[PDB]
């Protein structure tokens, strides 16, 4: 069974394939903003929204991955494989969770409509040849 | 932030901490169940329910963990570390995800009321000593 | 084309694989059942029901496969090849036709509601740990 | 439990033995026509018609036989045996399956009364000695 | 994505796969026909019909292919390759575009109903063996 | 007969002559976004819009050109002419199809009104002398 974690929200993975991978901020940055903006709603006993319902799960899965990484650092004495596994986690799974958390936070903050429009516009930008594409990449803004 | 994945749905981890590991089916079995019963919805573009949302996220996180274990079995060359990490995944996070998938599937099937009452009754039963409890546990079923 | 032989009836091959292959009765037993209970209806000049139509066609396809088995055992002299081909036919196509004929006979005799709920229930039952399920396997009964 | 695949619709193997075996088209051509004209109806979750049900089952049985032929070509080492059985599966079976698909596709396109009138008339034509039958045989058409 | 250029219009390639190459006029002839009959529309600034849209696109693609063949005949200096590519174009894509232009022109002229019924009847005729079919094919015409 | 593939849509070739040739993204980029955004509508059996009706044809013609290029790579042994023809295709016909696919995708995504306004504004930009033209080239955006 294959599931798209955005189809439920009106998007797809080919639509987020527009954005490059080095575009998404650090998981730390994303979690800090998620806290600052939605702590009382994520720690709440309510189906505040599907985006909260899903952000909670993403945060908990990243927490389990962090627990795995620290478990490795404690147990595995072989530095080669210890570091290999920890780096694999933080790089690859970090990228996937960056995409996910970015989608959810940005949508909660701005609007899924605005976020899909941002995706198409950023696709325009990154497809445009450099000689003609502005340096002011599209930026999501409430102001 | 500290999140409880069930508070949003009306439960806690202290209400599921009593359920022993012997209670929970394989993760493969629970995934087969979820597929057979709710594939047309999980693979659908709808906020069918917070349960469907959370189940999608859980399935995807488990897929990520399995890909991690596979990557380990391929790359790592110290069987000590290989065994350690693969076992830790399939046991610890296997059990967490078994709890999760079971809670969601069972609520979807029976009802929040039914499942929470069953958790209460099973907790009474398992907090009771053998010599003072019936020998056959409580049971959730549709025949 | 990709046709699902049960989609037209409300089921799927995934749903019928929710049950093990060691649950379905032999083709001879199922054909005896079909004769006994619906001979004059399957031999009738009427669309008595879509289940009757499908059952007629499945009976005819299995008859052709058995005709092939006899033809092979007779003409094909190579014992190894006749063994392998007859074994493949029997085993594999028998699992398939066992699932099919079981579904059709059972639906005719009981109800699509009953038979689908039975598939679900028996799958959950056989995936559940023994100590937390009813002790007697589910049975599909008329009385 | 002898069953006539056409009695359920209003014909019988006697009425179709009128047409020779050299008459019926290639099974590939017939499946192409089926695709072209009824892909959406056969891949639909509806009892659109008994003809639809029967055609689905016929296509599926032919697919089973195709898988048998492939599995033979790969497993059976004896070239003689594999070629003999594959040539059988094609000639001897495809004959019946061509007859069947033809009946179904025709009675779906043109209708039962028309197909039966056509069978009677083609029987007249093909029974007439060659010295007295016109060159313009009966054709099954809409114009 | 896999597209069928006729599904949008109510047909398939399996419904036109029966039409043999001997059936289709020259591409030059079909283009002369399209011009003479619908130039005032194809050269017009209107969504006259999906057929006109598709016909415009087909004509332009064929013009591009002809410019390609011309560029080859000019630049390339190995007559082997020159012949190979020019012939491949004018035969393979010539035939595809003949199918296309014919379908569009004929639908525009006669009707979706008429053309699809003609395809059905011609497929019956061409799937029939010579000894069992009339000797003169079906015909689409306005006298 | 000369046809403008945009006059039907409210544009011209002198209007797109504004945009340079090195402005349009790769055909791969365009096809990827076309898939992600319009797969279910292009593979649909409906005149969803003239832009779909035309995008399907453009994609199919580019597919035929890719088939020609691979056919060349297989057949033509002479590397000089093989590479010459393949490069001609991918460069020149690629440019033409880039212009076309860009027009259609951008219009479906944003609005033909917005796209023509973008064309005139980009003409302003690229006509403006460098010393006074901003680096932030005009960019199409939903956000
Ligand atoms: C919520 C997800 C996807 C993972 C965390 C699982 C967990 C910590 C369960 C505790 O009972
Ligand atoms: C890990 C979870 C909760 C979901 C899937 C993450 C992923 C691979 C996204 C791809 O864009
Ligand atoms: C649709 C266009 C312009 C080209 C493709 C032609 C084709 C593949 C026809 C199959 O019958
Ligand atoms: C190849 C097709 C379908 C149309 C014409 C492409 C072209 C030369 C556009 C110029 O802007
Ligand atoms: C697979 C099915 C339904 C039938 C096999 C062919 C037959 C027995 C008769 C056709 O004239
Ligand atoms: C549909 C028919 C008559 C045969 C093929 C399917 C089958 C026997 C089991 C389902 O996989």
Author numbering:
A (entry chain A), B (entry chain B), C (entry chain C), D (entry chain D), E (entry chain B), F (entry chain A): 1 to 143
Authors' account:
Here we investigated the hepatitis B core protein (HBc) that forms the viral capsids and plays a vital role in the HBV life cycle.
ITC of geraniol with HBc showed a slightly enhanced micromolar affinity (K_D_=94 +/− 8 µM) ([Fig fig2], [Table tbls1], [Table tbls2] and [Fig figs7]) and a stoichiometry of N=1.01 +/− 0.04, implying that all four hydrophobic pockets of the asymmetric unit are occupied simultaneously. However, TX100 binding to the hydrophobic pocket affected the spike tips, by flipping Phe97 in the pocket, but the geraniols resolved within the hydrophobic pocket did not flip Phe97, thus suggesting that this cross-talk is ligand-specific. Encouraged by structural confirmation of geraniol binding to the central hydrophobic pocket, we designed and synthesized a dimeric version of geraniol potentially capable of simultaneous binding to the HBc dimer. The analysis suggested that the dimer engages with both HBc binding sites simultaneously, resulting, however, only in a moderately enhanced micromolar affinity of 63 +/− 8 µM ([Fig fig2]).
